[PDB]
């Protein structure tokens, strides 16, 4: 076995060993041993394996906590354990092996490996730990030293796993272990059960397994090696990407390997001695020995001389003895004895013994070739032939604050051609294997006079040898290289670009002398070796930080004492290059601070300057001849076309190297994005003075928090914004377009690098554009349906008509019509709403423009629906539209199309839909018309005396009068406001009817002998008096609405000079009189019913209804009357005389004229003001529970105030309940809490449905609602899993609903014109359990830096209980424990991510809870003045830093785990196969997560409903009805969501709609994203959707408009049964309408 020829046949047992396909184990299976294992987190990159893969307690990093590789000159050569008795050293053992990081394999005693895969994972973990301990600990030359040491440890591991160990130690403990696991493996496989030769076939089968997994183990063990290591001396890199085990060292004999090891270790250390005896060589005695001065400076020379002598003597003895031990077996190889016999194997030791001992005295060419042997001499005889300029600072990059030019200055210090992109460089100019073809080495770099050098010391042809001994000589070599290169470059180019390219070349040197060259060539990776071993001699003596304290003063790690050397002395390099290319004079001390930028980024900026210069040259002519296009500029546009479209043809740009610009940009984007993602997950960031320190990772992490993902954005930031293009096309605006492939309609999105420059797309081939497309590209309104005598079908989109026959009955294309119409009719209706809410004038023109589109579409649909009915005449678009608009409601709340007990919603529907009971389609025409009309005196003695009205008292008598208050009269009464709905306001009750009514003994209508005129005049006078009284009542602050906080009830004054809320009071009083005049739901005074009767009589006698018209006419009269009132009052007022422009020039609008609605609004404002007053009083009385006895309840002051609040809220509970249910019934869809919140900003902190909570626990555990917080002084503490007491009933939110649907509501209105929509809240997220947060948050408003404690506690509590309840909702609601556990784990992870986004404030919902929660988080973390982005950063990293060794999003995850454990224990099951991971990754953007969840649940429901319907089909009416009722509303979901995706994909934190950082999503379309996302299993982590043969994933969009094949088989039956159901349900609805009409 020469190890070169015999082995290739003795090897090759990994291809003809079909067991290998099952013996090729691999990690990346389901969670490993429930100890943090994972599948994808390793298949993506096997390198990033952690200890948490088998048990991490037994399998921790090797627990031999004996100093590794940093020890004395220990060499087990003497009597140590058994070697030394008769055989002094059985085998040449270095300390390296004794530190072989296999103590992970001492504590492996366990059996459930259940695959070769887990055992592979264990051994690979050991290999990776060994590789790390090697690389971080190897103070040496050190390139060859570290590389050889790594491969030698790999070969030692090979022997160990193969069992061919020769060192004796604690191996049997793991030896019989690996025996038993291998036995387990061979009993797992039937094919390998063909191999049971005793003993368990250790040797042969372990060799087979080693040859099966050697590739993986070698690949991983070298992963922890920096790229600038040059591992393998075959491509002499990092040796990691060799794609095959490059070394054969694992195959050489173990004992031969170790004797070579040992001789080379002696060799390295003896060269160390021969050079370090020259430390004080100025006084080292190369002459007569002197020791008279008595110091350790001259006698040391002889000391080390004799030490080296004794070393060589002892090594001589041990060498010759080792020779004998491998030789004294001559006449006994082989007998079967174990006295002094060494037995190694049957294939590799035999040839060794017969060659090197029997017939040959010494060994052969191999060990002579690579490992040198006679540096001093060979003294072993198994091989013969013995030959016997600075020293200064580093920098940590203080970075600036985004001044649009991206130049980080400097930081702390220290004391002492043609852009070939081809592929990873094989044997010529290319890129390193990391950057196979991603950024594309520019042509100036190649041929830079240094990469054109095999060796630096070959500075010039004139010099023959090396002067590099002193620092100055090496620095001068660098200087002359720099000067010559500058000369060459100036020779090249001619100017201003000169300095730019000179800066780039300077950065190239600055990276080469730091060894991080992204590229490489035939003269690279060897000059790099020369640089390293040169630095080893001079400036190589300070590398002594492979230690435990590191002293932070020697800066010792080859790079640091190399890159630090570069940071210094680069002033001299740059000046010399300036003194090279003669552009020297102070033009461009000054240093080009660009070298700190990663070389990849500048290889981007270069080649972007190239593309820009070419493009601006090619467009400058274009922008001329297209001037509106004048006559003929299509030719030069076509030149630009072909330039930017060429697949590297002759006609086209240069630098693209073949593939067109689009593909190359895509590669660049992928590389940059994955760099961003790698930078996201790493624990290194900006430290000395709050600055990002170091190499690519930290710099990229600095870009994040500035955005600057999507290299387009980077470019837009760092470019000059004018280098390319007369058309200032920004690097945002991806500008979609399509082209042919160079199968014909392929599309692309290059941002300012698509054909047809920025605006001149229309202008090419002049065709002066019309108004429609100028709207279309703006994407203003986008009705994408394209209707253009059969049916003239209104096609939706690029989903072509596929008419199918399953069948005057319905037949073929016929059905499609209805269904298409069914969707169009639906969607357009829905569509109309948003654009109704929509409305410079450009969008107005767009709005008109799509209006006639819709009008014509409706015209054609109406036309051909008549044709449809005509075919089916042997159901009229007035029946059907009515039915469908009713169906919207009946499916929204009900599902259930039978129970019709509304009796109040009926009015709302008939106003909306069904006047005259399904007679007319006019709802649609009316909506269209509405879309059309949306194209955007008493200053006399006004003694208005009343004998029966005095100062207002309903809110208490005016000061100093105390008491006399009124309350809210309620369900139907007589004395005040006979009204079945909302309760009666006290202000209404004390209305001051004036002289309009009197008593005269008690009770009397005095308006009996009057007519219109004097009655109205008396009304006017009464209004005057009552508004004067109201104004006085509000000036004094007696009015509850008028009272402010602790201030004198007048601190808030409106910007009109009027008492607070007195505006609203006057408006409500006017509304009260208005609704009183005509018969409405008001009787608001003793017997006003007779007053409406009196009006009806006294008016409807002379006019001949007419009361209504007369009131409408005199409405302006009475409103100008109250205007004149306010004028005279404010001129009587001590302030300035205001005008009739008191709030409302016209009377209050008829919209907010529903007396119930106005009453409710007034009540809500009253309630908010009183709640705030009570809260103020509480915080006054609950800030010093003071002196509480257990349990520590409120002690009477806090207790009394808070109990007053409790009683108040107790009665307002039923009050608000009744009022809100009446309102919501009357105003279906809208919510009372909103109405209050926008109409009254006074209560934003108020949270109805919580202060008025209905759950009993949320009353008994919450005795004071929201104020069951700080009112209750108990200092709630979170309890972990183990705690004897639990969080039982602490936050017992009810069990989650299962079938509540997605909502577009509560989506935040984002900013100026951003306005995200088409995004809908996932069900589980909107029914999120977060209630316990709200109360203490109210307490948390005060007491910063102490509230965060409570926040952490409540987050843990709520996370735990939420996980418990969500698991309960998923898992025990089912028995398929595998997939149920997977789905529950996915839901829990999604919930955790949503909660984290809430903490980070990146959540998109702003419902009553989350809105206030986010506001309070901002006010808490943002102390007083921090910018919004800074507040986000603070509440983000506070979420990211630990309290005690564990970060917030680790404690929360633990709370989730403990909640799941409670759920499992209660259900009495096993812990899930998921949920056990102790380290989850980072979250995709919440929109992406919601999209994934939506697809998952949609495919689930589809596979359920369609299967049910197919199985069913007389009765399957219910089945396909369920299917189609779930489908259609779910269809508009997808359209809006896909539209939003297309708006936001590949955009980064400064160009996406939201500020949220996207662009980890590289997919042109959402369909392409999903089919490339979860086309597989549904495992607990990172694959959470799973869709299967939905049409037997573009059939996703195909089926939403139910047109695909898989449904066409049943479409005909389903449409007929649907139509019959429509007929019967229409009958029912008209019957119900007729029923209500009485």
Author numbering: 6 to 241, 258 to 409, 500 to 527, 556 to 633, 641 to 734, 748 to 786, 798 to 856, 873 to 928, ...
What do the authors of the reporting publication say about this deposited model?
Parasite-infected red blood cells sequester in the placenta through interaction between parasite-expressed protein VAR2CSA and the glycosaminoglycan chondroitin sulfate A (CS) abundantly present in the intervillous space. Here, we report cryo-EM structures of the VAR2CSA ectodomain at up to 3.1 Å resolution revealing an overall V-shaped architecture and a complex domain organization. Compared to other PfEMP1s, the ~310 kDa VAR2CSA ectodomain is relatively conserved among parasites. It is composed of a short N-terminal segment and six Duffy Binding-Like (DBL) domains (DBL1-DBL6) unique to VAR2CSA. Several of the DBL domains are linked by complex inter-domain (ID1-3) regions with limited or no homology among PfEMP1s yielding a DBL1-ID1-DBL2-ID2-DBL3-DBL4-ID3-DBL5-ID4-DBL6 structure.
The extracellular region from the N-terminal methionine (M1) to amino acid F2649 representing the entire ectodomain of the FCR3 VAR2CSA variant was expressed in baculovirus transfected insect cells as a secreted monomeric protein and purified by immobilized nickel affinity chromatography. As the binding to CSPG in NaCl buffer showed a 1:2 stoichiometry compared to a 1:1 in KCl buffer, the less compact VAR2CSA could introduce more unspecific binding or the proposed additional minor groove binding site is more exposed in NaCl buffer allowing CSPG binding. Structural analysis was performed in KCl buffer, as the highest affinity toward CSPG was observed. Next, we determined the cryo-EM structure of the isolated VAR2CSA form generated from a map of overall 3.8 Å resolution. The final model represents the ectodomain of VAR2CSA, exhibiting a well-folded conformation with clearly defined DBL domains and in agreement with previously published structures of DBL3, DBL4 and DBL6. The region spanning ID1-DBL2-ID2-DBL3-DBL4-ID3 represents the core of the macromolecular structure, as highlighted by a compact structure with a high degree of inter-domain interactions. The structure discloses the fold of ID2, forming a separate domain consisting of a bundle of α-helices, a shape which together with ID3, a 30 residues long α-helix (residue 1955-1985), serves as a structural glue for the core. Notably, ID2 and ID3 interact, as the C-terminus of ID2 forms an open-mouth shape conformation, which interacts extensively with the ID3 α-helix. DBL1 exhibits only a few inter-domain interaction sites with DBL2 and DBL4, leaving a cleft in-between the core and DBL1. The similarity of the VAR2CSA FCR3 apo-structures by Ma et al., and the one presented here is high, with RMSD in the core region (AA residue 450–2022) of 1.38 Å.
